[model samples]
Target: VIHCDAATICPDGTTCSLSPYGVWYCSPFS
Candidate 1:
Protein backbone atom coordinates (compact mmCIF):
# COMPACT_ATOMS: atom_id res chain seq x y z
CA VAL A 1 0.00 0.00 0.00
CA ILE A 2 1.05 3.62 -0.62
CA HIS A 3 1.57 5.72 2.52
CA CYS A 4 1.78 9.50 1.97
CA ASP A 5 2.61 10.23 5.63
CA ALA A 6 6.17 8.95 5.28
CA ALA A 7 7.05 10.75 2.07
CA THR A 8 7.33 14.23 3.53
CA ILE A 9 11.06 13.90 4.20
CA CYS A 10 13.62 13.65 1.45
CA PRO A 11 17.35 13.80 0.71
CA ASP A 12 16.62 17.33 -0.55
CA GLY A 13 13.54 18.03 1.58
CA THR A 14 10.83 17.00 -0.88
CA THR A 15 7.58 15.07 -0.39
CA CYS A 16 7.15 11.54 -1.67
CA SER A 17 7.09 7.93 -0.45
CA LEU A 18 7.63 4.63 -2.11
CA SER A 19 6.77 1.92 0.42
CA PRO A 20 6.51 -1.81 0.03
CA TYR A 21 5.70 -3.81 3.17
CA GLY A 22 7.02 -0.93 5.38
CA VAL A 23 10.44 -1.01 3.75
CA TRP A 24 11.41 2.62 3.11
CA TYR A 25 12.66 3.19 -0.40
CA CYS A 26 13.21 6.27 -2.53
CA SER A 27 10.48 7.15 -4.95
CA PRO A 28 10.83 5.87 -8.47
CA PHE A 29 8.68 8.94 -8.96
CA SER A 30 11.88 10.90 -8.77
Candidate 2:
Protein backbone atom coordinates (compact mmCIF):
# COMPACT_ATOMS: atom_id res chain seq x y z
CA VAL A 1 0.00 0.00 0.00
CA ILE A 2 1.15 3.54 -0.69
CA HIS A 3 1.98 5.59 2.33
CA CYS A 4 -0.17 8.70 2.70
CA ASP A 5 -0.38 11.89 4.69
CA ALA A 6 -2.89 14.76 4.90
CA ALA A 7 -1.96 15.87 1.40
CA THR A 8 -2.20 12.39 -0.06
CA ILE A 9 -4.47 12.04 -3.09
CA CYS A 10 -6.30 8.79 -3.72
CA PRO A 11 -8.15 7.53 -6.77
CA ASP A 12 -11.87 7.86 -7.29
CA GLY A 13 -14.08 6.06 -4.73
CA THR A 14 -11.27 6.01 -2.23
CA THR A 15 -9.83 8.18 0.50
CA CYS A 16 -6.88 8.32 2.84
CA SER A 17 -7.32 6.44 6.07
CA LEU A 18 -5.26 5.56 9.09
CA SER A 19 -4.53 1.92 9.74
CA PRO A 20 -4.52 0.18 13.11
CA TYR A 21 -0.74 0.21 12.92
CA GLY A 22 -0.81 4.01 12.83
CA VAL A 23 0.07 4.31 9.18
CA TRP A 24 -1.90 6.23 6.55
CA TYR A 25 -2.86 4.75 3.20
CA CYS A 26 -5.54 4.84 0.56
CA SER A 27 -8.67 2.88 1.38
CA PRO A 28 -12.00 2.35 -0.30
CA PHE A 29 -14.99 4.13 1.09
CA SER A 30 -16.93 1.92 3.45
Candidate 3:
Protein backbone atom coordinates (compact mmCIF):
# COMPACT_ATOMS: atom_id res chain seq x y z
CA VAL A 1 0.00 0.00 0.00
CA ILE A 2 1.13 3.51 -0.76
CA HIS A 3 1.73 5.96 2.04
CA CYS A 4 -1.39 7.99 2.67
CA ASP A 5 0.48 11.21 2.20
CA ALA A 6 1.97 10.04 -1.04
CA ALA A 7 -1.35 9.15 -2.55
CA THR A 8 -3.79 11.56 -4.18
CA ILE A 9 -7.46 11.31 -5.03
CA CYS A 10 -9.08 12.20 -8.32
CA PRO A 11 -12.61 13.33 -9.07
CA ASP A 12 -12.99 10.25 -11.23
CA GLY A 13 -12.87 8.15 -8.08
CA THR A 14 -9.31 7.10 -8.64
CA THR A 15 -5.98 7.45 -6.89
CA CYS A 16 -2.56 8.56 -8.13
CA SER A 17 1.00 8.28 -6.90
CA LEU A 18 4.51 9.11 -8.00
CA SER A 19 5.85 6.12 -6.13
CA PRO A 20 9.54 5.78 -5.24
CA TYR A 21 10.36 4.93 -8.84
CA GLY A 22 9.77 8.51 -9.97
CA VAL A 23 6.98 7.45 -12.28
CA TRP A 24 3.44 8.73 -12.12
CA TYR A 25 0.62 6.21 -11.95
CA CYS A 26 -3.03 6.01 -11.01
CA SER A 27 -5.46 3.42 -9.71
CA PRO A 28 -9.20 3.23 -10.18
CA PHE A 29 -11.21 1.90 -7.31
CA SER A 30 -13.93 -0.45 -8.32
On TM-score, the leading prediction is 2
- Which candidate would rank higher by TM-score, 1 or 2? 2
Write the residue-wise lDDT of candidate 1 on 1-30 in tens digits: 444554544444344555677655446443
Model 3 bad stretches (over 4 Å):
1-13, 28-30
Give every collision pair in model 3: none
Better lDDT candidate (2, 3): 2
Off by over 4 Å in 2: 1-9
Tens digits of per-residue lDDT for model 3, 1-30: 333344543345666655687766666767
User: Residue 30 of model 1: what lDDT?
Assistant: 36
**Per-residue lDDT over 1-30 for candidate 2, one digit per residue giving the tens place of the 0 to 100 score:** 333565655676677787899766678877
Report residue 20 deviation for candidate 3 (angstroms). Answer: 0.4
Positional deviation of 22 in candidate 1, in angstroms? Answer: 0.4
What lDDT does candidate 2 reach at residue 4? 57
Clashing pairs in 2: none
Give each model a TM-score. 0.25, 0.45, 0.32
